[PDB]
Design a protein around this ligand. Structure first.
Ligand SMILES: *[C@@H]1O[C@H](CO)[C@@H](O[C@@H]2O[C@H](CO)[C@@H](O)[C@H](O)[C@H]2NC(C)=O)[C@H](O)[C@H]1NC(C)=O
Ligand SMILES: *[C@@H]1O[C@H](CO)[C@@H](O[C@@H]2O[C@H](CO)[C@@H](O)[C@H](O)[C@H]2NC(C)=O)[C@H](O)[C@H]1NC(C)=O
Ligand SMILES: *[C@@H]1O[C@H](CO)[C@@H](O[C@@H]2O[C@H](CO)[C@@H](O)[C@H](O)[C@H]2NC(C)=O)[C@H](O)[C@H]1NC(C)=O
Ligand SMILES: *[C@@H]1O[C@H](CO)[C@@H](O[C@@H]2O[C@H](CO)[C@@H](O)[C@H](O)[C@H]2NC(C)=O)[C@H](O)[C@H]1NC(C)=O
Ligand SMILES: *[C@@H]1O[C@H](CO)[C@@H](O)[C@H](O)[C@H]1NC(C)=O
Ligand SMILES: *[C@@H]1O[C@H](CO)[C@@H](O)[C@H](O)[C@H]1NC(C)=O
Ligand SMILES: *[C@@H]1O[C@H](CO)[C@@H](O)[C@H](O)[C@H]1NC(C)=O
Lengths: 165, 583, 197, 165, 197, 583
């Protein structure tokens, strides 16, 4: 599956870079200061030393859960944030579509590894629409930053895996 | 914990140059959580912190920023708090918009490009700095057409087919957040506004019968002749840029062909046309492409210039007569000169006839008197016949010109003479460059009997001496030929004169010189200056009239070496000759 | 048996049409013509005997023909060799051909040496009711110059604005139903007129 | 109403000319010989001399009935004739839309004349779709020829009227 | 009261960061520093006392810091004039700055007078685990010519294909996290190497 | 009554060049209504009636048409009946189609223009004459992408974003009524197929330290450096069209700048670049725009040509020495020549120094021996110093060239000489046009000590006599100057010789003539021909070597008028002089 692994790596690197660009763009046209966080976003809470100790099932499970919830939040932004987000289009939709591409790639990789296929998690309850356009922008920051960190962790962990295999 | 606060108003649209107050209200819970009061609110116009224009007396939870002369059209105003007095936390942000309410659009004008939807345009007015959805409304008595929305706000092309023959009512509605305003409605039948496409397959034909006439023809779309279209036709001589206009009243009715008259008998013309609705409503079409045609050639109006020359053939019963003529200019040829017909009549004898394509004919005539005749034949027919009585060689010319003069004027060598008391039929003038290295190559021109002064029609050369000859032509033949010499223009001599001593004495020396060759005299030699000096004495100068060829230096010192220089002068200055020395 | 007779119909006016017939080849025997027409519909109307000229000529006139309607003509030669039938479909709107306009006049225009005034009249055969106006087409050229300039004047009068000064121009006209029913008439005879001094 | 009358005249002339062109086009790309008639089309069955005797109500009633049934048949062609008719597009739809424009103009004219407004005729039963594309072409011929004659009659009669008023 | 102390943090490696502090202005009185940090979340995690250097220096080392996580530092001067607190938000992913690469060598390439071989090593402070690789950026120029050509080699070795024959070139390198975390290191010292004959 | 019949088959698609049978079946009711049987069926291919290819034996109600070699792609075949045997009624009609089933498309190739959707193209094959819906199918292991449909059948641009890093499988499906065929599927990663945009903001900088070196720099999009792009760099001297190529192995790795070496020290160069994926997969980009730069100037490599001239100033303690030099060509200037520094050293005395921007320096030197020095200074520094020992006027030249020759070759006036036995430091050559109307305006050139033959570097004129001078330059100063005369090219004389009699006798006459002026001799006069004749006698001709100036005609008839003509001849022919007569 090494061609699957390097392909996934490169796709996640591309996605990371785009995410970074979009985040910077947003930050620069809509400067917003301090911490904008959503309680519903997944939290990374593991050490650099702990990443190095994980095993394929937990790695790939967390990765899929994280990226999928982010896909949900992204869709929610684009639908519900209203006007403002079009300022960042087509880039948002591009992000999202590469993200669903990457989730498919990960599912296929899990199939090739013949791991226990991920549970059929019931869908998350629908996200309450943002209070206002400002809340939408806030959401934008929080989401994109969390996605950035998620993809950094993803990339690093997948590279770790590759040394195991 | 909900958003720490909200800014009031949320969507402030500020009339440009007016003042604006924004208020940021924090919720008690945000205060007690971050341990701040409204004094820690920090206002930023985008990145740029507001330099404490804001005031916070309102109350513990409330801060207000006041802007004067808000100029930037779009400012992301954000309300932040210095959490714990250190970490600036964003509370809220609003895009402050500023601009002007739209001007009522004026000069609403629509045009129906033939085969296209109706286009309407307007003056937008001042810059609003706000997005304005200029909507072109249209309706008629029973239905409203789809709204056409301008992309750039200056014109909209409707989607629906032009509703000819119906009085539509259309108006522009301009809308922005500051206000909505509608133009005046214009009530018009689009048919009156159509711009026809230019005529196409423009073509011209000439009349073989009627050189002066060209027939225009064109194809007009006329929407399938739906529109009775009148036209405006302009034409010009191909060389002349100035478009002549056909009298516009002549094209006032629908037509496909027009007969232009009074054209030059053989000249190329260029034509263009444009069309409009017969009623003159709407707009003139663009001009057609240019079309060209040539008036059919015509009988040449004037006989060619005709003259004869004879080499002296004394002692022969036959004389070689070189008949020569100059081709008719196009304004006289009026067509393709195919051949010249030369007829020779020996008085009462049978007239000889010759056909010549060249400009000269050499015929061995007898010494009898002959009548020459010359006519120019084109496609259509022969010109009038030039007539030239060739006298017998023994007939002495009885009359010649008198008081013949020639002078340059306007860079032209003019010649003038007094007519003889007898009725001249025509004057012939002949000229050649005088040279000592080359023969007299003659050129010639014909002048009418009424002409008493004329310029030499040829490529005369400056600083070259021309011999000029004038020969009167009577019905009986040429008269006596007077000749003189003239210059078109003069210059300083190409070489000075060469001095030689004819005699030397104890106190005198007879200088001699040879006249400068006419090939080197660039003008009329008026005089010579002779300058001579000893090895130490002052140089003396003597002026001598050009008629003289010798001069005797006098009062010279004996046993003294003298150096002599001589220069010849024209009206344009002179040239020093070589220095000469004698003892 | 007799060959199929040749039949042709023409309409001078918007309300009558006439049909004429002749044998392809003479039988050489006493031969009667039975001639009839009927209206055409989809799948009164029945066959009416057309009124043959009391002169006994080989002609029928359908008086009061329906203008926007198709008729089928039935010419039948009958003789001891058996009948032979020619069937012909006719509609006035298509066979109509106005007579040439009558009384073409061309007059010099005083003070316009380059202009001619041409005038004519409706053909007498055409009652020129306001709903059955003609449209006229006019051609003009110098006497010797053969190329016809063509114009389509409105009404009985036209001013030719480009007549070559002092050259006699021949003028001729043709007429058609203003809705372009039928076909253009034959051109009238040529008329001669000289532009004014 | 004379401006209404001359306007209607000119609009009907335009429609007549277009109809003629389209008919010729059809005849030339789909040569079909003899009589193609629909029993459901209205029939003109009045003399040239009878037209001259009619009165405004009957004239305008017949005209509206005729043109409206033709509008129905035209719509039926365009929907149902299938592929072939697109060969004649946009011309067909143009015809139809000018035809509905002319029907509106006629209704408005009737209003200006203050004549008894035409009855609310119940809609005709839906036309059975054509048996085949060939039957569609046949329909095309029949319809367009009947429309041509209808508009000739219309034009002439309206001109007649104008001399009365 | 004491002014807000100045505090700054730097991370040499992907798993520890250190923070140093100094007074804006000396109070002139016996002054203690109380220093603490806590993890940041949405609305364990509580404040941990950072281990100050046993030397008593004004420094704390946060051992085993969470890499993808924000920390809030709390430096508090406490003295008889009352406490004064500096709060600082730090994340390694942003403050990280690798040490310069060590042991830059430049060697002539035999048989390629226009080429130089540059090689170096990971900074000893960076354990260069395969998931925490560095990306290196290298600059080279002739000795006197000041303009730096810039390349971004892959791995610890680069062949400069355009070295001016026989001119000594200075070479220097900088490192960054391969994902472009943090910021580029300061450039290494310059190394001298001469192209082969 | 339903449609009189139906044609079978209704939608015949005929393989082109094959045969086809159509059958028209009439319903009994149509027969009995129109009173016809199938014999009256008339078949038309559009307007064109089928010339009874059809056969009707099938049965009373049925007719069949057979076509052979059906060629027209689309024929509206219609079945008509002659109703009542007269009125042709249409029954039915079918569009007979003919064509070919599609060729399987070959050479399916796709390219990803950077920043555009994936474009794929194929060979369509033979003309099918039928509309073919060429569908570009694409899929990968989990999903099928939207079908891209070609408008013209040769290329389709998909709508979806290029799915980099995924092995897509794509194939073309061609469909027409005759048959459906699918290309081979190609399985490829689009990333390998990207064509990068050309580099932009191409720029060049020179090295003030290093004239020979230019630094290229460029900006590569690299999809945000997504693609490691290698490049191919070509450059040329601005004048030379032939693009030099940088050794491609040197650009094998991602870089933004390249140092081109071994450039000419002061020359303008043009550069262009193109890029491709480091791995060399995909396609080379288009070339960038051209960029230009100038190698920084450098110290001039060679001292200017240096020489001195002195007007004879006998009887003065000071002599005006006109020092003169020729500017260094760019290949030697290597830069902007700012000024020339001239240093004059009077043996042991203080050396005078002068700075001169012109090419000449006039200095009033004493009669002492001087050492001249000349250096060319540019921005960077002075060239090597030219050295020129100015001898004292009394020093007689001890050695001169020997066996000096000059001859024209290759349209060039070459000069050759034997070196003296002493070591020459340099040779100076001088030349001027010989004239009788103008002075000897000299020109000059410098030759190295090793040069023993050279061409005169100047705009020498054909048919003009040049005096040539060669002066040896020793360390002690110039040697003796040998001179000779030569022509670059000859022509016939501009004028013939003028003949005059020196003596006349009873049977002899001594002719005399003056040599043609050198301004009129266009070449070396080799000989003269003298021709003389009486009024009736045969013309005799005598040839005289050009060295002679007089000849005695002998055996002349007494009391006889003789006419004499004389011509002078060069290697390129001769010119007759004026005729002369004597008794
Ligand atoms: C055309 O007219 C002829 C006679 O004018 C018709 O022929 C007659 O037809 C009827 C009815 O079929 C028969 O009873 C007669 O015996 C026929 N007479 C002759 C002389 O043949 C013929 O049918 C008509 N055709 C059409 C199409 O109307
Ligand atoms: C068309 O035919 C009708 C019917 O006969 C003709 O009408 C008669 O014409 C004559 C001759 O001018 C008149 O005397 C009669 O009074 C008209 N009416 C009747 C009832 O006979 C008509 O003239 C013919 N031509 C045209 C152009 O209509
Ligand atoms: C930063 O740390 C200081 C002390 O290191 C904290 O100040 C103490 O806060 C507690 C709880 O509010 C009080 O009981 C103590 O009396 C305070 N001590 C002093 C010396 O002021 C301070 O609250 C901390 N701040 C944050 C944001 O964590
Ligand atoms: C980061 O901090 C950790 C925790 O102290 C350091 O790990 C120790 O490093 C020392 C010094 O090399 C070793 O002797 C110990 O064995 C390490 N582990 C422990 C549990 O103390 C680590 O070296 C620091 N630096 C880096 C780059 O990780
Ligand atoms: C503070 O002032 C604002 C603005 O007038 C007002 O809306 C708000 O209610 C005030 N709050 C209190 C607590 O008085
Ligand atoms: C806000 O707090 C500061 C410091 O605690 C105090 O000086 C100021 O008066 C307060 N402002 C209000 C409006 O209560
Ligand atoms: C068709 O009718 C004609 C004439 O009535 C006859 O000669 C022919 O045989 C008939 N054909 C058939 C197939 O019955």
């Amino acid at each position: 599956p090494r061609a699957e692994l390097d392909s996934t790596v490169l796709l996640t690197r591309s996605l990371l870079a785009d995410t970074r660009q979009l985040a910077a763009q947003l930050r620069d046209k809509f400067p917003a200061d301090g911490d904008h966080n959503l309680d519903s976003l997944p939290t990374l809470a593991m050490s650099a030393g702990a990443l190095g100790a994980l095993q394929l099932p937990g790695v790939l499970t967390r990765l899929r859960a994280d990226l999928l919830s982010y896909l949900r939040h992204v869709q929610w932004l684009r639908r519900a944030g209203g006007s403002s987000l079009k300022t960042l289009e087509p880039e948002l939709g591009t992000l999202q579509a590469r993200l669903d591409r990457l989730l498919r790639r990960l599912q296929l990789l899990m199939s090739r590894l013949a791991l226990p296929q991920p549970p059929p998690d019931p869908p998350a309850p629908p996200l309450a629409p943002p209070s206002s356009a400002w809340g939408g922008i806030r959401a934008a920051h929080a989401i994109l930053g969390g996605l950035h960190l998620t993809l950094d962790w993803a990339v690093r962990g997948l590279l770790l895996l590759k040394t195991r295999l | 914990l909900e958003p720490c606060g909200y800014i009031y108003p949320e969507f402030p649209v500020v009339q440009r140059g007016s003042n604006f107050t924004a208020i940021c209200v924090l919720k008690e819970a945000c205060l007690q959580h971050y341990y701040v009061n409204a004094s820690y609110i920090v206002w930023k116009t985008n990145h740029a912190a507001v330099p404490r224009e804001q005031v916070t007396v309102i109350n513990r939870t409330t801060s207000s920023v006041t802007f004067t002369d808000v100029v930037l059209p779009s400012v992301q105003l954000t309300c932040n708090i210095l959490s714990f007095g250190q970490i600036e936390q964003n509370v809220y942000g609003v895009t402050m918009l500023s601009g002007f309410p739209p001007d009522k659009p004026t000069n609403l004008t629509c045009i129906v490009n033939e085969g296209k939807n109706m286009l309407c345009q307007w003056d937008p007015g001042r810059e609003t700095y706000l997005e304005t959805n200029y909507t072109l409304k249209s309706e008629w008595a029973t239905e409203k057409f789809p709204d056409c929305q301008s992309k750039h706000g200056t014109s909209c092309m409707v989607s629906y087919m032009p509703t000819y023959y119906v009085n539509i009512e259309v108006w522009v509605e301009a809308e922005n957040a500051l206000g909505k305003v509608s133009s005046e409605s214009i009530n018009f039948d689009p048919v009156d506004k159509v711009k026809p496409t230019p005529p196409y397959n423009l073509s011209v034909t000439n009349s073989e019968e009627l050189s002066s006439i060209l027939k225009l023809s064109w194809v007009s779309s006329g929407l399938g002749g739906l529109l009775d279209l009148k036209s405006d036709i302009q034409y010009r001589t191909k060389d002349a840029s100035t478009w002549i206009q056909v009298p516009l009243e002549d094209t006032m009715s629908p037509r496909t062909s027009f007969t232009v008259q009074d054209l030059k008998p053989f000249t190329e013309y260029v034509f263009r046309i444009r069309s409009i609705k017969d009623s003159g409503k709407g707009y003139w079409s663009d001009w057609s492409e240019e079309a060209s045609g040539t008036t059919y050639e015509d009988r040449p109006s004037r006989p060619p210039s005709f003259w004869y020359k004879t080499n002296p053939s004394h002692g022969q019963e036959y004389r070689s007569v070189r008949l020569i003529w100059k081709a008719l200019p196009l304004s006289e040829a009026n067509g393709k000169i195919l051949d010249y017909e030369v007829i020779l009549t020996q008085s009462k004898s049978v007239s000889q006839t010759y056909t010549v394509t060249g400009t000269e004919l050499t015929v061995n005539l007898t010494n009898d008197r002959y009548v020459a005749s010359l006519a120019a034949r084109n496609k259509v027919g022969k010109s009038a016949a030039a007539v030239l009585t060739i006298p017998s060689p023994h007939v002495t010319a009885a009359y010649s010109v008198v008081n013949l003069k020639a002078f340059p004027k306007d860079n032209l060598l003019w010649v003038e003479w007094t007519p003889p008391p007898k009725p001249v039929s025509k004057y012939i003038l002949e000229w050649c460059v005088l040279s000592e290295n080359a023969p007299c190559v003659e050129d010639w021109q014909q002048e009418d009997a009424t002409v008493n002064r004329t310029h030499l029609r040829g490529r005369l050369l400056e600083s070259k001496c021309y011999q000029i000859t004038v020969t009167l032509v009577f019905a009986t033949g040429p008269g006596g030929s007077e000749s003189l010499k003239a210059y078109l223009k003069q210059a300083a001599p190409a070489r000075g004169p060469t001095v030689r001593t004819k005699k030397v004495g104890k106190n005198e020396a007879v200088l001699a010189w040879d006249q400068i060759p006419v090939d080197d005299q660039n003008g009329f030699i008026r005089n010579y200056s002779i300058s001579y000096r000893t090895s130490v004495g002052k140089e003396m100068v003597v002026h001598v009239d050009s008629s003289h060829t010798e001069y005797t230096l006098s009062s010279l010192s004996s046993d003294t070496l003298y150096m002599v220089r001589m220069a010849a002068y024209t009206d344009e200055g002179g040239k020093d000759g070589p220095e000469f020395t004698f003892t | 048996p007799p060959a199929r007779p040749v039949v042709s119909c023409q309409a001078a006016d918007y309300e009558n049409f006439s049909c004429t017939w002749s044998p392809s080849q003479i039988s050489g025997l006493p031969t009667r013509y039975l001639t009839s027409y009927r209206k055409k519909t989809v799948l009164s109307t029945g066959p009416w005997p057309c009124p043959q000229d009391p002169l006994g000529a080989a002609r029928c006139v359908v008086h009061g023909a329906e203008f926007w309607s198709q008729y089928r003509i039935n010419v039948t030669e009958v003789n001891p060799l058996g009948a032979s039938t020619r069937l012909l479909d006719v509609s006035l709107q298509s066979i109509l051909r106005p007579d040439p306009p009558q009384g073409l006049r061309v007059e010099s225009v005083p003070g316009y040496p380059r202009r001619l005034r041409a005038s004519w009249t409706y053909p007498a055969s055409w009652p020129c009711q306001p709903h059955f106006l003609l449209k006229f087409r006019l051609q003009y050229r110098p006497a010797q110059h053969p190329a016809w300039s063509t114009v389509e004047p409105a009404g009985l009068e036209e001013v030719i604005t480009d007549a070559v000064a002092g050259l006699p121009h021949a003028v001729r006209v043709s007429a058609r139903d203003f809705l372009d029913a039928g076909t253009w008439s034959t051109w009238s005879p040529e008329a001669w007129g000289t532009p004014s001094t």
